[PDB]
Swiss-Prot record, chain B:
Record-stated family: Belongs to the PspA/Vipp/IM30 family.
Species for this entry: Synechocystis sp. (strain ATCC 27184 / PCC 6803 / Kazusa)
Record's protein name: Membrane-associated protein Vipp1
Locations listed in the record: Cell inner membrane
Full-length numbering of the shown residues: 2 to 56 of 267
Effect of a null allele: Essential, it cannot be completely disrupted. Cells with very low levels of protein have no ordered thylakoids, are barely green and are non-photosynthetic.
Domain of life assignment: Bacteria
Biological role: Required for thylakoid formation.
Swiss-Prot record, chain E:
Protein name, per record: Membrane-associated protein Vipp1
Organism field: Synechocystis sp. (strain ATCC 27184 / PCC 6803 / Kazusa)
Covered residues, full protein: 168 to 216 of 267
Top-level taxon of the source organism: Bacteria
Subcellular localization, as worded in the UniProt entry: Cell inner membrane
Family named by the database record: Belongs to the PspA/Vipp/IM30 family.
Result of knocking out the encoding gene: Essential, it cannot be completely disrupted. Cells with very low levels of protein have no ordered thylakoids, are barely green and are non-photosynthetic.
Amino acid sequence: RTMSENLRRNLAALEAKISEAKTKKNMLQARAKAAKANAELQQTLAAAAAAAAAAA
Amino acid sequence: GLFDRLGRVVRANLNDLVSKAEDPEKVLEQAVIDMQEDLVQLRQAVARTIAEEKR
Amino acid sequence: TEQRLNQDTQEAKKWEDRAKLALTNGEENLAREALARKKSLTDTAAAYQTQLAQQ
Amino acid sequence: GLFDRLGRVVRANLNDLVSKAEDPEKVLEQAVIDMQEDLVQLRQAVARTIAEEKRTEQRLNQDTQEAKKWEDRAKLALTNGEENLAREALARKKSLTDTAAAYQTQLAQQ
Amino acid sequence: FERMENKVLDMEATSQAAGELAGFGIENQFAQLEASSGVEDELAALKAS
């Protein structure tokens, strides 16, 4: 019965850090998707706007 | 032994190339899926300790 | 070309009034934006004055 | 060898005839077009050196904030009277500050 | 988590990439110094009015 209090806390502490890792996963993946889009948009627009205007 | 160390290096080079081939973001969510079933294994064993305590 | 000169010079007066409005409203960043529009209109007005002098 | 030199002469005579066939004025503007894309290749590589420079600066910030974390663990060990754990934390702090000086040196070169 | 930390360094690298790309503007930047001082001079006159 003393062991089962210890196991019931260890089981709750394990799912608590699994739960934490899952919320972190969503936020980290979101930042990676956003950063991919920011780089492509900024570089593509700046290059095209300089290039077409100068040629014309 | 020397040939054990050399043997593990040729085997490790091929294994590391396969580890490079999969996307770390996909492998990280596979690791979370794997970690969720690891908690599924722990709850069955822990619950059986309650049954054994009651026995 | 004299009509374009009157169009761009009255547009510069309009932007100067927008700059005055921005300064009384404390929005100095919008006053600089309006002054940038005013400058391109006064610089093209000098080009049209030069074209009109030739004509 | 003699046949290598003779071989390159028969091949060079045909190649020189093809070089005569194109107009030097058209080939000179093709060379300027080619030279403009050569600058396009250089800017991509140079910009990636800026990204790599910033990556070593990120590692420097990671290892220096990790050293501050370990210093806080050392402070906790000292208030808890566990001086043996304070020395363990200081050993982690030292390897992080010594590698931070290596990254500072790398960043200075970059 | 370790492989995900390497992916976090892609965000750090992307931030420095935008900073290095912005650095191409430093020769032109003198125009921003004259523009900014000009707007503060007329704003000071507007505030004094």
